[PDB]
Amino acid sequence: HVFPSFHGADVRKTILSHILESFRRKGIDPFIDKSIGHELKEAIKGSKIAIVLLSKNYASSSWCLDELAEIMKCRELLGQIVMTIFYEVDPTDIKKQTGEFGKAFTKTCKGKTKEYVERWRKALEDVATIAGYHSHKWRNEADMIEKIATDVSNMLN
Amino acid sequence: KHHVFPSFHGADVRKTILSHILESFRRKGIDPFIDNNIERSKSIGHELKEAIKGSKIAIVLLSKNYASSSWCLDELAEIMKCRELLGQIVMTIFYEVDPTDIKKQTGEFGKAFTKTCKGKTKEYVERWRKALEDVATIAGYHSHKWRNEADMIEKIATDVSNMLN
Amino acid sequence: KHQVFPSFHGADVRKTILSHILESFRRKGIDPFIDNNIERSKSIGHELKEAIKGSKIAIVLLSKNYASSSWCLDELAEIMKCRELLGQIVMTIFYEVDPTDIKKQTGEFGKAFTKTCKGKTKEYVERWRKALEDVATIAGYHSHKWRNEADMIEKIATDVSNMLN
Amino acid sequence: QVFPSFHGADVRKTILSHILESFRRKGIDPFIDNIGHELKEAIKGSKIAIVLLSKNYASSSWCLDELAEIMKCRELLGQIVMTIFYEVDPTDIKKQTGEFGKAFTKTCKGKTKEYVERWRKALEDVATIAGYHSHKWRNEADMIEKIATDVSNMLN
């Protein structure tokens, strides 16, 4: 059904734990595991939906960035639906790679071919404009999670 | 949704070997995509991307001057994109060109490539390069090694027919 | 289906990965050739050549020490000969070894090869060398690129089934 | 049903993957995580514990805390402990020697003298629970098939 992409250190114990509880209550079966691997690519291609959980340090990991590039690639050629969650990060900081998010991104770019960099850069610009859920704009995390889990469930029908 | 999509540098092969290959196809009931049949009024680059996505097989007819055309390189990058994500089968024809000469974009082929990179971001440029890196390692048909081109075409059309599953 | 001939260096893989591979085959109804089932009193090398000639597919499981054994190279030379003259399908598995280390007769694999060549007519040496050259350019399965070997085995056993139809 | 304790770097990609496929074919559902307390509860609640021992198992104090908890549950609860000696000899486990022992003493340097010996007693004890030694088996595939059937049978 769904492939969540996240930076575990930011969200594993906190918001991500609750999200996975929402899914199971609703019967949604998520897939949980610069390297990526051919098996990880295969799992992304075989997911109808991909949830992009963006966080302060998501761009500090080139594994998380390679996942983003594949999801956007699967959005284009396959019919993959991409849903975005902006967790204590502003979408414009993502589109323009600024704030602390940007400081982490440019560090993941030090000593990197200019061609990898912009494949990532292009992906962040694009994903930042996919309508999603911004935590700062929501009344409480619990209601936000419940809204996301119902939307994903509906889309899976 | 088409049967086979040929990628070629027409100035090198359009009038000659491509014509015979397509005559073999029609003889055997194979349905190629013919760019000359794009309805006038339409944007050409959008019809090519859509035609690639819909091709079960893609025939990349590589030639000495293939990389002089950004049309030919943009197509190759799209085909490799469809090979990985879709189930597209990619078949290669090396027409009077050496496989490693394309892989490293050196020799006479390379001088043609580096010229087409002028006024292009280094990232688009290398999106072409990886496509050339990858496609150069797909085992295919080398024209220089054949004694009679007509028989080669018959061998190619038979391989395509069998693969059409 | 049935006929498959596995070529492997037993010390590297017999007890481990090879055992799992053969278990996948039987699960899917594939009937491989088991050297351990040669009739006793027979001559091993004559039973091996006959078994290769009779296999639709050959699985070459390459490993660091594959070239340390002239049994593994003599079989490889016979496999390539049967691919050319018969229709034998040759599938490659690179097990914790790099394809160019096989192609360039180098790395730890190469030093194991160069010792097995000592005291051999120059004719044995290059019959083996080209076989390594040839098999190294056949697209196959690289173990290092896989994180869960069990899934790799499942992918291999499924491809063999398909190819047999 | 079953709690496997392992040093991922040694066995994740190889033997453990085949074991886990064997279990699933037989309908056994192991507990996979992806020091502790939620983990202790999961061990406390596992009918069987499979100790997959490897050379570097003792290089991780996280793996050693798991062994001490498993042995604790064998004693007070009814936990069945299944042992797998993977390219390591049980007596090297019993006496903490070889490369296995060399990793243990490094995991013990700069470590409380009290942790060390509860670990030692656990290794000494687990090394004497009859299990499956890889060196003694004819092919890894048949061994795994034997283990999954014994675990399956015991689960009834």
Ligand SMILES: Nc1ncnc2c1ncn2[C@@H]1O[C@H](COP(=O)(O)OP(=O)(O)OC[C@H]2O[C@@H](O)[C@H](O)[C@@H]2O)[C@@H](O)[C@H]1O
């Ligand atoms: N609207 C048009 N725009 C451009 N060229 C046009 C147009 N209409 C007709 N043409 C003709 O097409 C010619 C270019 O044809 P080629 O030189 O054969 O093409 P090339 O640049 O080598 O690559 C063309 C590409 O088209 C695809 O169908 C094919 O796979 C190949 O990659 C032009 O010189 C022109 O005569």
Ligand SMILES: Nc1ncnc2c1ncn2[C@@H]1O[C@H](COP(=O)(O)OP(=O)(O)OC[C@H]2O[C@@H](O)[C@H](O)[C@@H]2O)[C@@H](O)[C@H]1O
């Ligand atoms: N005549 C014999 N009778 C019984 N056992 C024998 C005999 N000759 C050898 N063996 C046994 O075979 C062992 C060597 O087997 P491997 O380590 O697998 O040897 P390797 O050189 O890797 O041979 C692998 C080769 O066998 C072929 O079936 C296969 O295609 C591959 O090329 C020896 O230790 C020995 O026990």
